[PDB]
């Protein structure tokens, strides 16, 4: 991750947009600060706030890391934009071509307490998202 962003900060940026644009357009906010670009990245169409407060519901295995136990599941569907990747041997970020899938799912995330730079307002933060379902 790019050191200038908490994880949460990171998580935010990758996968917290209301309306975000074609993928193509989206995925620049995320890809300029990479060296190349996302294979695959699902935008909840959500907000940071809401998110905080899924990490809130019970704790469960997280489906894509089974030794992890810190994850949360959302208790409805909501809207979201998946993007993959066309282009995977791009080699530079202005190259990044993505198809655009949007969904209505249940997401998983993975929360931990807030990184020192955190605003302190939300003590327990989403680090990172497990899957959607
Ligand atoms: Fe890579």
Do not use: E
């Amino acid at each position: 991750r790019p050191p200038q962003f908490t994880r949460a900060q990171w998580f935010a940026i990758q996968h917290i947009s209301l309306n975000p644009p074609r993928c193509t357009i989206a995925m620049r906010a995320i890809n300029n600060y990479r060296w190349r670009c996302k294979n695959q990245n699902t935008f909840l169409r959500t907000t940071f706030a809401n998110v905080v407060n899924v990490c809130g519901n019970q704790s469960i295995r997280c489906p894509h890391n089974r030794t992890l136990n810190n994850c949360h599941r959302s208790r409805f569907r909501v809207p979201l934009l998946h993007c993959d990747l066309i282009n995977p041997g791009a080699q530079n970020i202005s190259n990044c071509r993505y198809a655009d899938r949007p969904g209505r799912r249940f997401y998983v995330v993975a929360c931990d307490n807030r990184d020192p730079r955190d605003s302190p307002r939300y003590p327990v933060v989403p680090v990172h998202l497990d899957t959607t379902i």
